[PDB]
Subunit: 232 residues, 2 copies
């Protein structure tokens, strides 16, 4: 695990790294958020920003020093601060940014700055390739509402890795979330859709926990299931 | 205002009618649901099905008898029974059907049959015209999650009418109704988006009330304001 400033990096495969940023906040402590960095031939692809523009810049600085390839594009997984808080740093660096159209639509409402481009999805959940030009091994899937209405998901082709973002909870989590933009009705089915979209992923990377097995997916849907009846 | 089988039709403008149908529920008597019929030159456009296939067939029969123009297409406003229950009646009649891609994605989970085509929306909420061919005066807008994640909205060009579907409740409603699929965080902003998208609409048609003034929007948005709670 390479430390770089306030960011931590963990190689998950040749060509794939997890980036982790921390939001240092009173009462709680540091809240971790994870994203991905993927080397695809002669360029780098990033999934998710860090919490802040300055932390995101540090990712880019780490990429420069450790990998020394240019960053072609970033995909951002939904319109929350842990995923899109550093969009300005990506834009300032001349990186082409992508998000779900709905994520761009909601961005202003949240405190976020919108990605430059909007991804669109088929009825099957799969991204319309015309809207995701040159994503290389990044396979982008919209599993349905869950953690959020806009949440998207990313598989990394030629690896066992799939990224659930904040949709999939840890195999030992007890809660699905605190905020009313989680879709309690559909969550379980969204969790499962994700699993069905990347049936070969054995390593399941997520926003707030160390990578886990496919048990995270099962656990997350099960939770979602039991809760559906208890929400006031 | 006219009765035809177990449906009710109400002319709202030259060229525009409200269709009403009823589903007996155990919770209480007949529950009404409203949709639209629009004459555009030499063809008819339909917004929303009735609750059932049979009831939707009667809408077609009424169109035949009262307007006697062919039905070019139907747009459906979200994946719930009152809006999409009659999809099979539309497809058996050879009518081209459209829904939010998300509505089509969610359909199976919801007991619904998917539309034949998927609508896609820009970051600003307006429908991508390439996905909505020949919609004539139908101006389709996705205001953001509210009643449902997938709820869409329709303005009728050259009229004062805007259709909020189940997003908007009338200005005298005691509640926002069923919140099971609702996005409590974004609802108020989605309500307002709708209003901002059709700033000239003075007649606001909705799924479960008689047409109302713009006060319905304000009232809806304000009820929804009371749903956002800060969570520690
Ligand atoms: Zn989030
Ligand atoms: Zn998160
Ligand atoms: Zn509904
Ligand atoms: Zn309804």
């Amino acid at each position: 695990d390479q430390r770089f400033g306030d960011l931590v990096f963990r190689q998950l495969a040749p060509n794939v790294w997890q980036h982790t940023s921390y939001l240092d906040m009173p009462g709680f402590g540091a809240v971790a958020s994870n994203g991905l960095i993927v080397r695809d031939g002669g360029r780098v692809l990033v999934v998710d920003t860090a919490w802040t523009d300055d932390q995101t810049a540090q990712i880019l600085n780490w990429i420069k020093q450790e990998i020394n390839l240019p960053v072609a594009l970033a995909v951002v997984t939904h319109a929350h601060q842990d995923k899109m808080g550093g969009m300005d740093a990506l834009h300032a660096a001349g990186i082409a940014t992508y998000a779900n159209a709905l994520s761009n639509q909601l961005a202003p409402q949240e405190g976020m700055v919108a990605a430059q481009h909007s991804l669109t999805f088929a009825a099957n959940g799969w991204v319309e390739p015309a809207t995701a030009p040159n994503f290389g091994p990044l396979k982008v899937f919209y599993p349905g509402p869950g953690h959020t209405s806009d949440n998207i998901t990313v598989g990394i082709d030629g690896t066992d890795i799939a990224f659930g973002g904040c949709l999939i909870k840890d195999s030992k989590a007890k809660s699905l979330g605190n905020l009313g933009d989680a879709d309690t009705e559909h969550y379980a089915a969204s969790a499962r859709a994700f699993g069905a979209a990347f049936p070969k992923a054995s390593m399941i990377v997520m926003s707030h926990s160390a990578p886990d097995s496919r048990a995270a997916i099962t656990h997350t849907a099960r939770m979602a299931d039991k809760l559906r009846k208890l929400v006031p």
